[PDB]
Amino acid sequence: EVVKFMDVYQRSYCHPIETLVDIFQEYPDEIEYIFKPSCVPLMRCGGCCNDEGLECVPTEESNITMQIMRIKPHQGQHIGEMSFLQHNKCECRPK
Amino acid sequence: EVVKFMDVYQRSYCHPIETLVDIFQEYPDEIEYIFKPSCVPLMRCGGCCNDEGLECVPTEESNITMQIMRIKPHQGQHIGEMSFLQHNKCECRPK
Amino acid sequence: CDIHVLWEWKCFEE
């Protein structure tokens, strides 16, 4: 009925979380394209720190490669591999 | 070592997803105060639709109540119930 | 394959 404080606190605190990201944000030199899907699920730091003086930042990263459909003018539909950055570890640090 | 197309497409498609939301983002009029945690995990529609002319919107919503701390300088610590909007069902609909 | 509904593979071949 009510989410208890320590549960809310632990679940909200800075950590890698599945985040839906637009592919254009990750591939800015490809904004001429239409992608399918147009967004991908990525592990990315999220949540809050104990202070307005701290920010939640990645401290360990890796890549993941996904099959994405891509089309642009004067091209037909292609499927290709696109790599994305994931966050494996996050920490709270001064801004 | 490559995520297959149909798996990325299904995982990215419009659906309720756990989202970490800043309590001020929900309640800008509360920005004078300090909350602990300062963000809460909420189910919110996320992901992408088959066409940038559709948008992922909720078709079922509910309130969730959480135990949150709030305080002001040179003041007692408060703990209390705070309610937030969650999204229970999402669909792709014209913008 | 309605544009407003999650698609199966067949859709992406049309």
What is the bridge-based pairing of β-strands A2-3 and B54-71? parallel
Helix or strand run (H / E) with residue B9: helix B5-12
Among chain C residues, the shortest Cα distance to B50 is held by C3
CA distance B68 to chain A (A): 6
A37 is written with which tokens? 């899907």
Sign of torsion, CA A57 B87 B70 B73? positive
Among chain A residues, the shortest Cα distance to B33 is held by A52
Q: Are B66 and A8 within 8 A, CB to CB? A: yes
B27, B62 contact by CB (below 8 A)? no
A52, B76 contact by CB (below 8 A)? no
Q: Are B6 and C9 within 8 A, CB to CB? A: yes
Among chain B residues, the shortest Cα distance to C6 is held by B13
CA distance A17 to A15: 6
Q: Tell me the structure's resolution in angstroms, rounded to a single decimal.
A: 1.6
Closest to B20 (Cα-Cα) out of B36, B35, B45, B39: B39
Method: X-ray
